[PDB]
A paper describes a structure:
Ryanodine receptors (RyRs) form ∼2.2 MDa calcium release channels located in the membrane of the sarcoplasmic and endoplasmic reticulum. Triggered by either cytosolic or luminal Ca2+, or by conformational changes in the skeletal muscle dihydropyridine receptor, these proteins govern several Ca2+-dependent processes, including the contraction of skeletal and cardiac muscle.
We solved the crystal structure of RyR1 Repeat12 at 1.5 Å resolution, which shows that its two halves are not symmetrical. Each repeat consists of two α helices, and short single β-strands at each C terminus assemble to form a two-stranded β-sheet. However, Repeat2 also contains an extra three-stranded β-sheet which breaks the symmetry. This sheet is formed at the expense of its first α helix (α1'), which is considerably shorter than the corresponding helix in Repeat1 (α1). This loop forms a large U-shaped lid (‘U-lid') that makes intimate interactions with the α-helices of Repeat1. However, the RyR1 R1043C mutation (R1044C in rabbit RyR1) affects a residue that is involved in multiple hydrogen bonds, including main chain atoms from the U-lid.
Author numbering: 861 to 1008, 1014 to 1054
The structure:
């Protein structure tokens, strides 16, 4: 079931904030920019503005954001605009210059400190995490979705096989995705 047209804008904004959060998480752990990945020196080429990612990487991120939204809908959630003023009123987290990369990129995820999941929303985050298509893309160090010798990609690790710490990282990523939607003024019921 394709993503409804009225959720296409939020698919883009969601992917952008997920990238900012991912980049922050990496930079906290000592990662810095370089054009070729180096896991010993912790250099990563994705520590750039979202719009400056290679098109295939941007497209993958948009696909993953869209599949969070489609999985919410498959779980029966009602997702719709409720507060048209919320987006204008959003602010970004202002990090110190110690978070800026050599290319001038500094992450600026949304300040969602005011957002509080309702019980039904907490339950939807839990059901997203437990859904059979949820994976940890271990090489991307990120939550993602897998929707369709060796056919399967073992590096997309099903949630049910993760150790507790990585389950917690995966679930928290989905919590921030849902809180991002709420921050932009969507109700989720």
């Amino acid at each position: 079931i394709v993503l409804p047209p009225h959720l296409e804008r939020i698919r883009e904004k969601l992917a952008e904030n997920i990238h900012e959060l991912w980049a922050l998480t990496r930079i906290e752990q000592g990662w810095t920019y370089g054009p070729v990945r180096d896991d010993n020196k912790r250099l990563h080429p994705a520590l750039v503005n979202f719009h400056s990612l290679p098109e295939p990487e941007r497209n993958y991120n948009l696909q993953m954001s869209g599949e969070t939204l489609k999985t919410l809908l498959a779980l029966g959630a009602h997702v719709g605009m409720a507060d048209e003023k919320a987006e204008d009123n959003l602010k970004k987290t202002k990090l110190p210059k110690t978070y800026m990369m050599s290319n001038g990129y500094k992450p600026a995820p949304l300040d969602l400190s005011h957002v509080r999941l309702t019980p039904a929303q907490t339950t939807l985050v839990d059901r997203l995490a437990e859904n059979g298509h949820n994976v940890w893309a271990r090489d991307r160090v990120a939550q993602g979705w897998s929707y369709s010798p060796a056919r399967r990609n073992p590096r997309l690790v099903p949630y049910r096989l993760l150790d507790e710490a990585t389950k917690r990282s995966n679930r928290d990523s989905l919590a921030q995705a849902v809180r991002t939607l709420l921050g932009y003024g969507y109700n989720i019921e």
